[PDB]
Amino acid sequence: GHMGNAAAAKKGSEQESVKEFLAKAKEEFLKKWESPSQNTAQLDHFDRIKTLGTGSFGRVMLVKHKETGNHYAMKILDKQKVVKLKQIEHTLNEKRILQAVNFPFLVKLEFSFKDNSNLYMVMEYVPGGEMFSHLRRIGRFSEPHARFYAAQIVLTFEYLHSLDLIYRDLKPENLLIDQQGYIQVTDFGFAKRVKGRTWTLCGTPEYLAPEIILSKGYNKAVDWWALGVLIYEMAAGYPPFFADQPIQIYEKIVSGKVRFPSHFSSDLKDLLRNLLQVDLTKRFGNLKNGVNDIKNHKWFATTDWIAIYQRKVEAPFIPKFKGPGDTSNFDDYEEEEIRVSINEKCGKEFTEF
């Protein structure tokens, strides 16, 4: 067979230990899920420094905690805009997930609170910026570099899926790089507890699995499809399916055809053909052997999964960091005031936040 006795025994034991870890992690998650924490700080506890990002519902700002001097990333959501954009459930669910999960590649929520106007989630500041920026600047990542990031996503999805959480929002724009060069996942607006199937059309065109496009009930396998897209994009510099307009992207996604750069290794192409598999009965991550089909694939043969989890592997790339509060890896935005109303807005809708 492919493994001799020692290697087979070691692999079997490793896989059983993963099961044991995940059972404990699920028990811990469910405790925090059933008893979420609230109201752990206030706005006047922080100095606002710079806007790190903006969206249709709010902003993320670099802030400095006055008492400790620690920097944090503060997501500010305008309650009235959240209601107008039909994002109440997503906002409450994101906070509930963030306060309940615990994993080295998932951002840590340190404080949350609300006022008359806004909701606030204060997260660890991840100073390396988005993977997206580094990828577009460098062009493409070499296979070992792509593999280092991919391994972290595999472990993170293995963790999330054990909690019955589907992620649904994977893309380089949503992956931040920390001071040690490891990945942080921050956005949970589309994540959902799904033991069986779910049906919502959500995601980003290039990263949508065929079954989402085709309006099917779908499961956690969409995240493994998205991993395939991510690995391809990291290693090529562009995603597998692109076009001027989303409709044409969707036609390519559902076609069952994918083409690869000539510099992709055969091991990489084999992995990608099994992740970017339109047939759900054949997609890696969706078979009887679960995540092990991915973790045991030849492309990952050099990956020490425990060392990645322990953050003991030297990162391929360390973002520039001139000190605490350095924002050089983020875009520049116009700075707007944080207006707080004299009257409470949308109190009922956000009572649980």
């Binding site: 995601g203 290039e206 090529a236 076009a243």
Partner: peptide, 18 residues
């Protein structure tokens, strides 16, 4: 080339959700 096709797509910047 495929890279040129990617540039031609106009979808080289940050991509929003649908």
């Amino acid at each position: 080339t495929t890279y040129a096709d990617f540039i031609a797509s106009g979808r080289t910047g940050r991509r929003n959700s649908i």
